[PDB]
Amino acid sequence: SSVSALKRLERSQWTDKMDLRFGFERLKEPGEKTGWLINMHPTEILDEDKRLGSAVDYYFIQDDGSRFKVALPYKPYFYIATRKGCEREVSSFLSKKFQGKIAKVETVPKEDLDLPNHLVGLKRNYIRLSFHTVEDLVKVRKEISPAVKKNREQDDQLDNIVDMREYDVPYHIRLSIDLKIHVAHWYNVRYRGNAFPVEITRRDDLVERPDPVVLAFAIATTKLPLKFPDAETDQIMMISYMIDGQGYLITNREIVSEDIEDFEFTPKPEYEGPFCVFNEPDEAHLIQRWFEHVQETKPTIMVTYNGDFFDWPFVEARAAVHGLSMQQEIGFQKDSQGEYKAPQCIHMDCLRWVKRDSYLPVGSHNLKAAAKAKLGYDPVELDPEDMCRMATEQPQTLATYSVSDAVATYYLYMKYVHPFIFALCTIIPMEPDEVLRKGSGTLCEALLMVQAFHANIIFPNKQEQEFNKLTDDGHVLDSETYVGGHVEALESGVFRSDIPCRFRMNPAAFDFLLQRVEKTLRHALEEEEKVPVEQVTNFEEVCDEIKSKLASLKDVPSRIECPLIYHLDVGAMYPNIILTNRLQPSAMVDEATCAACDFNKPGANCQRKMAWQWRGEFMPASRSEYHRIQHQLESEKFPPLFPEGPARAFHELSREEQAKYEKRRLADYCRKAYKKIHITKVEERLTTICQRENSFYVDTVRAFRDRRYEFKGLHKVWKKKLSAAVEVGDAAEVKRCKNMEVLYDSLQLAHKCILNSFYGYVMRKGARWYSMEMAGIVCFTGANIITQARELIEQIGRPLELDTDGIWCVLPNSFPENFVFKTTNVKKPKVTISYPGAMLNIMVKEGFTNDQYQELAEPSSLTYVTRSENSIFFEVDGPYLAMILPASKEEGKKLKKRYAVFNEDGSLAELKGFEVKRRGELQLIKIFQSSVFEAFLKGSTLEEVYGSVAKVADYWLDVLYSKAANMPDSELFELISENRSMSRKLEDYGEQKSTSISTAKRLAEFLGDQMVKDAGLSCRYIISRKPEGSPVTERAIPLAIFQAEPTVRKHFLRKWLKSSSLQDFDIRAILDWDYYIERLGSAIQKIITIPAALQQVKNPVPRVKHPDWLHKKLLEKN
DNA sequence: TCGAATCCTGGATC
DNA sequence: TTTTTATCCAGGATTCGA
C-alpha cells in the first residue's frame, strides 16, 4: 500500500508545485467565479476519511488572463446482469466478499435493443457496481470476467452472473459525457465548502473567445561533414521563436564569429516579424537564457513542426550534457504513448492536422510547400551543410534565414489550425490534443455514446473478432467483403468546345423527354425552388421553346456539333441514402425475431427488403479434411515464448498462434493436395431492415446536416457584412466582423468533417456499432443510381468518365441548357433553372423514393404514422473549355482517374493522377507532362492541335539524341539523376533484392561500412553503359564518385565498368542513353500518339512506333 | 524458345 | 489504449508449359 499511496500523492504534490509555478492556483475558498475552460486532467484527492478518491482537475482562464483550477470528484461504475431472480443472492455475495472494496450497488432498469419483442415496451434490469477508486474497479473487473465466458459457454453464488457492460469507457470521457461539460465554453462555477461538490454551469450569453499566449520555435544544429547530427558530438547553433507576434533569436558564439545585429523581417505587410537577439558566449548560457526567458512569459500553448521526433529530444539531450533538468525547469516529459506532454500547457504539432485534414498530397507535406500553398509565399532555404561556413564567414545571412522557419510556423498555426481545433472541441467530450491526435472513428464513437447515454441505452460491448469461421458447406472463410463501387474511363483523347464532334442520338429519346417537359419542370420549380407553379407567369413560354428545340433534335439526330461539357454529381450521396432508407447499425434483423414480434400481423408493412453482394474468399479444403488437420495438431508440441521455457501443447497456445499454425499447415497441405490454393465467389443476399426501430442515429445525422447548412448561411451573411465593414474601414468593426466570420467558417468545417466521419466509422473493425450489411447496401444503391444516370445519357449523348459519385459528359450544342422563370413572389422575383438537373432528379425521385418510412406518434399510444421521404438530388457544374484523357498502351485496360480540364479563362481547372503532382520518377518526365498539358490548349483543329503538341516532344527528343551537347555541363546531373532513397536498412530488408540495395552495396564498397550502418539511406544514381547485358538491378552507379577525387574516381570506375580501355570518363559517354529514350518513348506513347491513333489521325511523331497489336488493327483497317 | 501469371517492393490514394 | 488499410499502380524477376 505505502509505495502506491506515497508514489501517487508525491507526484500529485509535485504537479501542484509545477502548475503553481505557472500561476495556476487552486480555488482556495468558497466563492463564485466565471471563466473559459481550457483544459482538464484526472487526479486523485483525499476524502473525509483521508482515503484516496478519484477526481478531475479543470483549468480555467479569465478575461484579464488570470487563471485558476477546480478539482471535482466522481465515483466510476459499471454494469452486470444476472439470471432470473438472482439479484438478491448475487448482491448478498458480492457485498459480503468485496466489503470495503466497492462503494455502492443498486438495481436499475435499462433500455436494451436486443431484447426480443422489446418494441412492446419491455426493458430489462441490470445491477450497478460503483467503486471508490479506479484501481479497485480494475481488480474487481479482473476477478469477475473469468466467470463470464464459461457461463456463456454453458448456454454458484458468483457464477450465476451472466454479462457486463460499459466496463471500459475512459474515466475522463465518462465524466465529460455524464455532466455535459465541454471545452471551449464559458462557465460559471460555485464552491460552497467541503459540504458540497463544486457546482458548474454553462452560460450561453457569452460568445467571443479569449486570447491565449502561444509560442512557436525552431532549432538549428551543428553537424559533422556528411553526417547527421548527434546530441553528444554536436552543439546547438541557433534557437529562434515567436511569442505574441514578437520574435526572438539566440545563437551560439562558439561557431558564430561575431555578434549578430537585430533586424526586422517581413514576408508580407501583414506579417510584422520584429525580432530581438541576445549574444552570449556559449551553448550553456544559451540554454540557460532560453529557460530563464521562457519561465518569464509563462505561455499556455506551444507549437512545433514534427517536434516530438526532432526538436524536443535534441534540446533535452543537450540539457542533460550540462545537467539541466528540463523536466523540472519546463516540465515537459515524454509519455508512455511516446509523445511529449506537460500537465499545464498543450503541445500542438501542425503536422498531425496537415496529415489528416489538409487534403494535400504526399509530396506537398514539406513545411515549405505547405507554407507556400496556405500562406502564399515561400521561405527561402539555406542548406544545413552551409551553416558552419556561413557562421564563420558571414553569419548574418544565416541569422536572416533563421526567421523563415519560425514565422511561417506561427502564422500557419494561428490562421488555419487555431480557430479549427477549438471549434471541433465544442461538440465532443475530448481534450484538444487528444482530439487532434485521435482518429475520426474514435471521434465519432465518442459522439454517438452521448446520444446513446441520453436516450438511456445500454452500450454494446466491443465487437470481439472471430477466426477461422466456416462457411455452412464447411469451407474455411479467409475474408469477407462487400462489392465496392466501380470506376471506368469509357473514352480517350481530346474534347474542345472550339472544335466539332460527331453525334448519333437515338430518335426515341427526344420523344420520351418531349412527352414530359411539364413534369420535368414542375418538379424542379416546386420541390427545389419552393415556389408553387401557381405563382410563375411565363411558364408556358419556356415550355414552348423547350418543346420546339427538342423536336428540332428529333428531326436531325445524327449531326456534327461543337460539344458542351458538363459535370454531374450527387451532393453527399451516402448521408442522403442513409437518411432515405432509415439504415441503422441495429435495424437489420432476420426472421428469428419477426417470427416472435407481436407487430408481425397480416398486412404489417414495417419490413423493408434490400439486396447487397458479398464476395467470399475461402480455402478449398472441406470440413471433414479440416477436422483431420485439427486432430493432427492434438499431438503436436510447440516452442515456448523464450528459449528457457517449456514446450507448449496445442491447447496451451494463444488463439492467434493456433490460427496462424492452422493456416500455415492447411495452406501447405493444400498446395499439393489441390490444384488451386484458394477460391473467390460473389453471392448476393437479401436483408430485412426493420423500419420501426428507434431513430436516434438517423436523427443525429439529420441534425448535423441542417446545422451545417445554417452555419453556411450565417457564414455568407457575415462575410458580406465584413466586406461592408472593410469598405467603411472601422478597425474595431472590421475586427469584430472578421472574428465572426472566422468562428462561423470554423464551425462549418468542423460540422462537415464530423458528418463525413459518420460513413467510415462502421468500417472500423471492433467498433461498438458495427455491421457489414449497411456498408454493402449504401454502396450498391449508389452504383444503381450512377448506372441509371448513365443509361439515360448514353441515348442522349456520350459519357466520358464515370466516378464514385459523378459523371463527366458531352452534350450537343443545340441542347436546352438554362432558363429563367418570372415570379411574383416578394422573396424571389426571377429564378434560374438548369435543364440537365431537372431532367434527372425526376427519374431519381420516381424510382428511388421510399414509401415505408414510419414514425412513432405518441409513446403511450403504440400508434405510428406512415410517411414517405427522399433527399437524393443531382447538381451540375460547368460548362468547361477543354477536357483531355489519356489511353492505356495495353489493349484491354481502361485507366482510372486520369484527366485534365480547363476553365473558359484557360487557367487550369483540374488535373488528376499525373506524376506532375508528385516528385515524378524523373525531372524530364515531370517537365514534359507539364509542358504538353498547356500545349494542348493551343491551335484550332485536331490536326493543328497534335501538329503543335508534337513540337514539345521533338524539343526533348533532340536532347536525348544530342547528349545534352548544348546543356550546361553539370546541369545534366540535376535533370537525369534519380534521387530515390532506400526505405529501410539492409539489416531490415534481409533477403530482398533491388536497385537501391545494389547501389547501397556499391557505395559501401567505396565508403566502407561507415554509412550503410545508417537507416533510410539516401541515393543519387544513374544507369551505366559499359556492363553490357548485365541485369538491370546490377547496373547502377552512385553519383558522388563523379564528384570525388581524381584517382579514386578513375580506380573505382575501372573497377565498376570492367574496363581500363575507356580514356575519357564523362556521364555523356557512360549513360545508357537508350534506356532513358525508351522511357520518354513510353510516357509520350500514352498521351500524344495512342490517343491520336484512337481518333483516326496519323501518327504525329515519326520517331516513335506503335505497339504491335495497335499496328495490326490499324493495318487491318486498310 | 517465348508468352503470360504470380509475387514482390515501393510510392500513393483520398 | 491504440493507428487506414485495401486497393491501385508501376516496374521488375522468376516460374511454368507448349
Ligand code: SF4
Ligand atoms: S421489422 Fe417489424 S415485424 Fe419485424 S421484428 Fe421489427 S418491428 Fe417486428
